[PDB]
Design a protein around this ligand. Structure first.
Ligand SMILES: Nc1ccn([C@H]2C[C@H](O)[C@@H](COP(=O)(O)C(F)(F)P(=O)(O)OP(=O)(O)O)O2)c(=O)n1
Ligand SMILES: [Cl-]
Ligand SMILES: [Cl-]
Ligand SMILES: [Cl-]
Ligand SMILES: [Mg+2]
Ligand SMILES: [Mg+2]
Ligand code: NA
Ligand code: NA
Length: 326
DNA sequence: CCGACGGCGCATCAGC
DNA sequence: GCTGATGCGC
DNA sequence: GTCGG
C-alpha cells in the first residue's frame, strides 16, 4: 500500500493487455514492474526514481509521472469508458472464460452476468461452474479458514493411505493472512520419477474428499492435477461458508523439493527465479533442475535434497517462503 | 537493434 | 482413434 | 513493455 496507487494502475494495465489486447508479454511486463515497485521500501516521488528499478522502463516511468501529478491515467480512463473493453474484462472474471472466449461471447451479444445465466447451454463445463460460483470465487479466504480446510484435507488423505503426504502450498505456505484458493501438493511412495506402482493415486484422494462432501465440483481432472471446488462444513443454523477453489497436484515423491518450490510460488517469483536460472545456465521446472548444455539443450537432472540446493545451483541466497511473495 | 520473455497439466478441436 | 495446436489455467 | 548482448 506504500505505492498502492501506482501498483494498482500497473495491474489494471496488465489486465488490459492480457484480456483485451491479448498481449501476454505486455501483461508480464506490467506485472513485473508492479511487483518490483510493490516491494520498493520508499514512497515513489517520480517516474525517474521508479525507472531505476528493474522492470520499469521509459513508458511506465511516464505513466507514473502522469499518475503522480493527476492521480489518474488518461489511458485507463478511456479503457474504462470503452464498452467492448469493459465487457471483455468482466467476462474474463468467470473461471474458464479467457481472453478469446470473452471476445467471442461479446460478438454474440453475451456480455453481462445476466446474459451468461440465460445462455448456460453455450458454456463448457468449467465455465458453467465458474459462473455458478462467480461471487464466491472472488472472495478471499481468511487464514483461519485455510487452517480448517488444511485439517480436513490432511486427515482425509491420511484415512485413504497413511503414506500420502499432503502439503498446502501457494500463498498459504508463504504465510499470507488470506488466500485466493487452496493449493495442495500431494505425494505417495508408489509414485516416483522411476515408476507408478499404483494407479488412481490422485483419484482415490479426490473420491474421499467428495465422499465427505468437502469437494463439491470438478473443473478439470487428470492423472496428476485436479482442479475443482470445495466447501467447509458449517454448523446448525449457521450460514454456509462460500465455496472455494481447490487445486491438487500429485508429484513424484523423489522430486518433492522442485515440486514444493514450484507450488509455493509466487508465480512472479518463479518467473524471476527460473529466468535467473537460465542466465546461470540451468533450467527449472516442478520436477527437476537441469544444466543447459553448450547446445542449449537440457541435461540430466542434478541431485536435489532441499529447496536450498536449488537456490545454491543458481547462486541465490536461500529465501524463506514468506519472502517469495513477489 | 531486436530476440527473448518459465514451464507445464488438462480440455477441446482440427486434421488424418 | 492418435497427435499436435490452441485456450485456459496452475 | 523491458531487458541485455
Ligand atoms: N502462472 C503461474 C501460476 C501459478 N504458479 C504456481 C506458483 C503459485 O504459488 C502456485 C499456486 O497458484 P495460484 O494460481 O493458486 C496463485 F498463484 F494465485 P497463489 O500464489 O496460490 O496465490 P493465491 O492465494 O491467490 O491463490 O502455482 C506458477 O508457477 N505460475
Ligand atoms: Cl505481447
Ligand atoms: Cl527435487
Ligand atoms: Cl524434467
Ligand atoms: Mg493459490
Ligand atoms: Mg490455485
Ligand atoms: Na528500469
Ligand atoms: Na477467467
Amino acid at each position: 500500500t506504500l505505492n498502492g496507487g501506482i501498483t494498482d494502475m500497473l495491474t489494471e494495465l496488465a489486465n488490459f493487455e492480457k484480456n483485451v489486447s491479448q498481449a501476454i508479454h505486455k501483461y508480464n511486463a506490467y506485472r513485473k514492474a508492479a511487483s518490483v515497485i510493490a516491494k520498493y521500501p520508499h514512497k515513489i516521488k517520480s517516474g525517474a526514481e521508479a525507472k531505476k528499478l528493474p522492470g520499469v522502463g521509459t513508458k511506465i516511468a511516464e505513466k507514473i509521472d502522469e499518475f503522480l501529478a493527476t492521480g489518474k491515467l488518461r489511458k485507463l480512463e478511456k479503457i474504462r469508458q470503452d464498452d467492448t473493453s469493459s465487457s471483455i474484462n468482466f467476462l474474463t472474471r468467470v473461471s474458464g472464460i479467457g481472453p478469446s472466449a470473452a471476445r467471442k461471447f461479446v460478438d454474440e451479444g453475451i456480455k453481462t452476468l445476466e446474459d451468461l445465466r440465460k445462455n448456460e447451454d453455450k458454456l463448457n463445463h468449467h465455465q458453467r461452474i465458474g459462473l455458478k460460483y462467480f461471487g464466491d470465487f472472488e472472495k478471499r479466504i481468511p487464514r483461519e479458514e485455510m487452517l480448517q480446510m488444511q485439517d480436513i484435507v490432511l486427515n482425509e488423505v491420511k484415512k485413504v493411505d497413511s503414506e500420502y503426504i499432503a502439503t498446502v502450498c501457494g500463498s498459504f505456505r508463504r504465510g499470507a493472512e488470506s488466500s485466493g484458493d487452496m493449493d495442495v501438493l500431494l505425494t505417495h511412495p508408489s509414485f516416483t520419477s522411476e515408476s507408478t506402482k499404483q494407479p488412481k493415486l490422485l483419484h482415490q484422494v479426490v473420491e474421499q474428499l467428495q465422499k465427505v462432501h468437502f469437494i463439491t465440483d470438478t473443473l478439470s481432472k487428470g492423472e496428476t492435477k485436479f482442479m475443482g471446488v470445495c466447501q467447509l462444513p458449517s454448523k446448525n443454523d449457521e450460514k454456509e461458508y462460500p465455496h472455494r477453489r481447490i487445486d491438487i497436484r500429485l508429484i513424484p515423491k523423489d522430486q518433492y523439493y522442485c515440486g514444493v518450490l514450484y507450488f509455493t510460488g509466487s508465480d512472479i517469483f518463479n518467473k524471476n527465479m527460473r529466468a535467473h536460472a537460465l542466465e546461470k545456465g540451468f533450467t527449472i521446472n516442478e520436477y527437476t533442475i537441469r544444466p543447459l548444455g553448450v547446445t542449449g539443450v537440457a541435461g540430466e537432472p542434478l541431485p536435489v535434497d532441499s529447496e536450498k540446493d536449488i537456490f545454491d545451483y543458481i547462486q541465490w541466497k536461500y529465501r524463506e517462503p514468506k519472502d517469495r511473495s513477489e
